[PDB]
Design a protein around this ligand. Structure first.
Ligand SMILES: Cc1ccc(NC(=O)c2ccc(CN(CCN(C)C)C(=O)c3cccnc3)cc2)cc1Nc1nccc(-c2cccnc2)n1
Ligand SMILES: [Cl-]
Ligand SMILES: [Cl-]
Ligand SMILES: [Cl-]
Length: 285
């Protein structure tokens, strides 16, 4: 495969995330970049605890990444090690890490700029996520776990959608609730995913609305203070929706409301979301 990179071209680093069978670590790649002899990357791999279902899953993820091709707002595949060893997937490294912790870090200095984040930045993140999801939708790729924790931020404030997957400890993460044999991100899920096991680009649009709530609360937990229990499920069914977060404009909140239509087909497309948000950007962008 043309994606193949020699394993001995890597020096492995500090762990960036781990779950039960997988992890992602920082690494240095020699001779991988054509313009840079030495470069920092991120590498995904399995732990010795991993079984065939995991190895299969990681190979399947590599295949989907190659098939999708590149996009500015999707974490960028750089290579892989699949022969004569445990499988590694290599991507770009993103300077600021995940969007949740970045927003939290930025709470004190929020200005609404080198001095801190503004509404413009929040709208930029909103727009870039929509573009990334528009790209995935155009390849018929349904994300199923869209959330700010699965958005990375590169040094130029460029959003990169990912899915930690096996490199997140879903069994020990309050964002994932036991619902069957696995843990699911219930507070981000569309009702038809919760109740009917239906996942589509339209359920990704619901999750996108929840992600916007995360952005405009500077990394708040959706449905703050609400446990996922029978009362939660009844509330969603009865039509309960989150109120506008403090840094959102009325137009941004209108967008979240649209994304949370009970009927999936009534939710707006990621194409239209991208165009609408772009139109909300101020002149200096
Ligand atoms: C190394 C590394 C290896 C692999 C990946 N690959 C993915 O995350 C991934 C790619 C494609 C897909 C495919 N699917 C369909 C399947 N799902 C329905 C299951 C999507 O829906 C989809 C498509 C496209 C995007 N997101 C979701 C799923 C997951 C990322 C990283 N990098 C990575 N990962 C985590 C953290 C960092 C990090 C941390 C801190 C600083 N700097 C960097 N970097
Ligand atoms: Cl760095
Ligand atoms: Cl239920
Ligand atoms: Cl808020």
């Amino acid at each position: 495969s043309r994606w193949e990179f020699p394993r001995d071209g890597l020096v492995l680093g500090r762990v960036l995330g781990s779950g039960a069978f997988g992890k992602v670590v920082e690494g240095t790649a020699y001779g991988l970049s054509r313009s840079q002899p030495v470069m920092k990357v991120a590498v995904k791999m399995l732990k010795p605890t991993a079984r065939s279902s995991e190895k299969q899953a990681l190979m399947s993820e590599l295949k989907i990444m190659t098939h999708l091709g590149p996009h500015l707002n999707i974490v960028n595949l750089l290579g892989a090690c699949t022969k004569s060893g445990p499988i590694y997937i290599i991507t770009e490294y993103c300077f600021y890490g995940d969007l949740v912790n970045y927003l939290h870090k930025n709470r004190d200095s929020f200005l609404s700029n080198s001095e801190g984040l503004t509404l413009l930045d929040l709208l930029s993140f909103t727009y870039q996520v929509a573009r990334g999801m528009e790209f995935l939708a155009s390849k018929n790729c349904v994300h199923r776990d869209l959330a700010a924790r699965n958005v990375l931020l590169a040094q130029g404030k460029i959003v990169k959608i990912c899915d930690f997957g096996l490199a997140r400890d879903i069994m020990h993460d309050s964002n994932y609730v036991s619902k069957g044999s696995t843990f699911l991100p219930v507070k981000w899920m569309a009702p038809e995913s919760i109740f009917d096991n239906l996942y589509t680009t339209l359920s990704d649009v619901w999750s996108y609305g929840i992600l916007l709530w995360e952005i405009f609360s500077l990394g708040g937990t959706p449905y703050p203070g609400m446990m996922v229990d029978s009362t939660f499920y009844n509330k969603i069914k009865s039509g309960y929706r989150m109120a506008k977060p403090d840094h959102a404009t009325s137009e941004v909140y209108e967008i979240m409301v649209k994304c949370w239509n009970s009927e999936p087909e009534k939710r707006p497309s990621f194409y239209h979301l991208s165009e609408i948000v772009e139109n909300l950007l101020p002149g200096q962008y």
